[PDB]
Amino acid sequence: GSSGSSGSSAEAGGGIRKRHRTKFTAEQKERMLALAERIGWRIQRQDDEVIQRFCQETGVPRQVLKVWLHNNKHSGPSSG
């Protein structure tokens, strides 16, 4: 096939907008925290299924789920 929509996979280097006005609630917060503590505050082509999936249960954008970790980890509201 391939004709209407362009090949999804082509280039790696991405970057769509910056962390917009987010409002992670105890849910999203904890959700990510539990994820970060699950994936390792990291992202891989393996956890993708989880990353993307988690975005289905939460709704947070990957790009956010990424920076978030950074916006969280490395000095911040650390509890666990």
Curated annotation (Swiss-Prot):
Compartment annotation: Nucleus
Residues under site feature: Required for DNA-binding: 69
Tissue occurrence: Mostly expressed in flowers and inflorescence.
DNA-binding region: 17-74
Subunit structure: Homo- and heterodimer with other ZFHD proteins. Interacts with MIF1 and MIF2; these interactions prevent nuclear localization and DNA-binding to inhibit transcription regulation activity. Binds to ZHD2, ZHD3, ZHD4, ZHD5, ZHD6, ZHD7, ZHD8, ZHD9, ZHD10 and ZHD11.
Protein purpose: Putative transcription factor.
Record text about domains: The homeodomain differs form the typical one by having namely 4 instead of 3 extra amino acids inserted in the loop between helix 1 and helix 2.
Protein name per its UniProtKB record: Zinc-finger homeodomain protein 1
Source organism of the structure: Arabidopsis thaliana
Organism classification: Eukaryota, Viridiplantae, Streptophyta, Embryophyta, Tracheophyta
Gene: ZHD1
